[PDB]
Homo-oligomer: 428 residues x 3
């Protein structure tokens, strides 16, 4: 097993009772690493074997206020009336503001729909067909509608919190996998308890991301977005609604937007509509779960405290700590370093991209361990299994043609592998 | 007294002036947790008691450049002059640019204020009241003003750093509360010194936030904003000024903006003003201190290193570490586990929101300790005091009606509590 | 030789054979701090000296998808044709959309460039030079182009990862300097190995930054930007291209933009172009490296991964951890505390700014150590050398005139220093 215990002590704890007790500290346990502790009673040379393993440490999205986003399509129309016809009596009437409708539009329109209307001056003379010679009125409105009724629920991730899953193997052979309470001792067997002291992750300053979920396809995505109530043009949430029903038809009462998302000019007798709306569907496709951002792999979650869980691809970039309290027993450790040799089969993917290149490598390891791969461009560490298995790791490059040598290491035994491949650049 | 010492050692330290010394390691102490260390001399058979407690670990806003924002109101005006009247003598004069003013606007306008002017062509013939038939001139200006003179100071938080407040109890009973220097030993009494080794915090990737302060009400807020010199439309700082005085009237001499924050459409005989300005008063009211963002509660600070200090609601998400060096003394520990039972009195607030629901719980604790509450949807941990006291904890829910059971745990003694209440969804 | 070892233990390590081994834990080592370990054999007076030092811990930009940004300038043109001249036969022809070009534009236009065209009505009657009285047609196009051919490559930093550099001094005096792999033991000499357990940095929630590099000057900057494919107006990346070739002339096949970055006002016979494009050169100039953001100094990197390395100015805000495994040897430590006295020579710079004021201080230290400076306005810590040297440190103030007392400390020896200076406020 692995070298995980880095401190062992005999302590005198009191309440006035006082008992001599043993206490071991495991300060840095990466996921996949395993400690094997043996406890021997005074009378019997037999040892009880306890195994302590960090199965996984998940990053959980700590959400802010959620909102809904419709699949918006731009729309507009316009009608012109002479200076003595219709509502246009001596210019634009004062009541025709941004939420006004004209009876001369004749097109099917949602009176409760989200949009922006207005009155403006048009051509006047008889050369454009008006008895009056002064300029006329052009009643126009630009608005958005949601055909197909596609809706996403957007939840910005205000922060990310580690959630550990530990695996403890009893001397009886029973395996207990659970999310531990930090600082709370877990009684494993007679005289011995295990306490999870907390988690550490070396990745910091993660860019702002949001959980995006389509309400009737249930597909998940993770991408930047606006906070609830914000409408910065160019991001998901520029059009947002406070409920699913409001987003179904984009109603005024529940949705907000920036009216400049639809461009409208005013010609003599028509209007051209220029959609400036950012496609939420295109963002959901590009950022679809599973995805890799900032060296963190984000996938669908196996628990209920968040549908998305994250973890670094470099397995040594996140760690747990343990305290083992044992009384009436003597501690011994099972420790051996690992060895591994490797060959890389293919190197494909993209360079200077968010995902990073994909390096395929087959590797034989003497035991379950952690393999390290270090190039001049990037480094990573991943868990490997005993025997011969193939692995696909993510390494970043900044050039198209890759032909360099990198180092491979398990437990201090260093080897070399050959990366030969070609990478592409993604469009924006 | 809690279980905080996880390693104790006897060392041989030299300077060669070699001395045998003891050193205890406290690697993970949450705020509210407390260690009790007893030291006995080889001669005297009784102990001196030293108590080490992490009172608080505060997150301090590491500010970038600050700026000032006014309570801005959109505004514009326009006048139309025939081609042989007024300054319009030969169409729009080239000198009349974005900072030019017309003496015909007839408004008590601030000629030093931030805004944008311009001249455009209008209706020409006698059909719109001009003897000349060539097209007239429209002198217009869109600008922004600050009635009531309300100003906010905005300081973007480029990063957050932990600031620990530790509390040492001497055998004399004297309590010393101070912010320790990491790595600097603090002499407590004869032969013993304690050293703070640093702080750890698990919440990562916190969204960009800014300290916002009203200048003559002093009320604080924490919300997203532009950096200094940036003017993204839709966030605080779209209009920003380099001094309090320039923001009082929004002077062009010290303020910057995007002129598209105000839309102006030119029609004959008047112009309509489209306000696209984000209400800073609306943002500061919603994000008012105290506020809870991403599992962190931000409140007014008790020190002088910034007016806002943050801390995780789950107190086990932040921790400090100590080293205790003792010479000529034998270390013994006071350690006892806590038990608690509780009942939940009220469950109110919102769901799927930034702050989270509020769970009120009466709890009896056998000692100062940490209580854990784990539900199927969320989990938290909070400090409790000895005896019967009431607490208000924040738990997140994604549905309106809450009627479920959750687990309560102090020191590995688990009981159950029932949550009943109704929650509302926040509007954007 | 500082006090870095906080735990030493004797362990029984097995693989049926077992062996007794010593293991020392160094849980918190700041940059510049050094541990001195001495190993003696039971029957031998020969002592072997081992020095463990953290040279520095660097933050590395974990890059997202890269893109290219040109130095764009606004441009537009316009022509007007009477109702029966040119393409204007029956009003504006429908086949003239945003990507159309009129053959009557005088200046030569890049028909493959990025821009936006359109047809609009204008003055009609003989008062503006047309026989027909119906409104004429105005053919216009607003676009951007890249004179001088200046291009930047932008790489958003999705996250930051620490990268430690340690140096080990052998008993032979040899110094071995390398970036360690976390968890991999480094054999130093017979019976002793050193393992790096990981890095902790207390700075969290760092604002989103991007690496900006001019392709032909190689100058670097670090500033906020748009993600790849995003075009929020007001940030770097509002105009972005997927290749250096597309950015050389701002072609449409590879670049994207928001057409509202160029404003066009169509008047009777001319067109005026309004540029609201954010100057990238101004951002790269202001944010040029080396720069200080959020208490972290970002400088040109000395390694191969990334051109930029970050590190806290407060050296106690980042730390490494070591484990020393030694067999058949007894451990003894060399530990001396430091003393230092100092006086500040000059206090200049800005207040309420991202960089903070710069404080120059001459300081006499008895050894290599860490000096702490505590004011009521700010606190920092920096590495000092043995002897008398001058240091420049960054401390933050919120007022213009500084007249306050501050405290200096090395190894628990506290004195006082008197900062006096004047600071200025930066414009937006
Ligand atoms: C190695 O890992 C595999 C899969 O997790 C497991 O089945 C096997 O028992 C492990 N080997 C050990 C624990 O020796
Ligand atoms: C429990 O905490 C309170 C306030 O934090 C303190 O006054 C009291 O002395 C503590 N009880 C102990 C240390 O036994
Ligand atoms: C002090 O630091 C300097 C520079 O880091 C180094 O050259 C010198 O050897 C150090 N002194 C020691 C290790 O005693
Ligand atoms: Cl972080």
């Amino acid at each position: 097993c692995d070298e995980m215990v880095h401190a062992d002590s005999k302590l005198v704890s009191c309440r006035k009772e006082c008992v001599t007790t043993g206490r071991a500290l495991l300060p840095a346990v990466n996921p996949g690493q395993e400690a094997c502790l043996h406890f021997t009673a005074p009378g019997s040379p037999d040892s009880k074997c306890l195994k302590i393993k960090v199965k996984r440490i998940n990053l959980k999205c700590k959400k802010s206020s959620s909102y809904f986003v419709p699949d918006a399509r731009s729309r507009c129309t316009s009608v012109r009336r002479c200076r003595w016809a219709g509502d246009c009596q001596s210019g634009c009437p004062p009541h025709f503001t941004s939420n006004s409708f004209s009876d001369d539009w004749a097109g099917k329109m949602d009176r409760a729909g989200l949009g922006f209307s207005g009155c403006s001056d048009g051509c006047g003379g008889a050369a454009c067909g008006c008895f009056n010679a002064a300029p006329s009125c052009i009643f126009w409105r630009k608005w958005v509608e949601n055909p197909h009724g596609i809706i996403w629920k957007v939840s910005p991730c205000a922060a990310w919190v580690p959630s550990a899953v530990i695996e403890l193997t009893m001397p009886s052979g029973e395996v207990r996998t659970f999310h531990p309470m930090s600082g709370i001792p877990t009684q494993v067997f007679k005289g011995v308890s295990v306490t999870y002291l907390g988690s550490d992750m070396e990745v910091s300053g993660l860019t702002d991301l949001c959980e995006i979920e389509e309400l009737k396809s249930k597909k998940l995505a993770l991408a930047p977005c606006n906070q609830a109530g914000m409408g910065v043009v160019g991001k998901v949430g520029e059009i947002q609604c406070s409920s699913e029903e409001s987003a179904r038809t984009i109603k005024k009462d529940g949705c907000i937007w920036n009216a400049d998302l639809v461009g409208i000019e005013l010609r003599v007798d028509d209007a051209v509509c220029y959609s400036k709306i950012t496609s939420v569907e295109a963002v959901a496709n590009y950022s679809a779960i599973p995805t890799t951002i900032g060296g963190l792999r984000f996938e669908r979650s196996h628990d209920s405290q968040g549908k998305i869980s994250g973890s670094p691809l470099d397995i040594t970039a996140i760690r747990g700590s343990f305290s083992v309290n044992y009384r009436g027993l003597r501690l011994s450790l099972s420790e051996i370093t690992a060895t591994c040799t490797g060959e890389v089969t293919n190197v494909s993917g993209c360079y200077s991209c968010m995902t990073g290149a994909k390096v395929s490598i087959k590797l034989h390891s003497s035991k379950n361990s952690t393999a390290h791969v270090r190039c001049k461009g990037d480094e990573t560490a991943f868990s490997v299994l005993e025997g011969v298995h193939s692995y696909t790791v993510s390494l970043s490059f900044d050039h198209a043609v890759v032909d360099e040598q990198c180092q491979l290491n398990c437990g201090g035994h260093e080897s070399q592998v050959t990366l030969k491949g070609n990478l592409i650049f993604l469009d924006v």
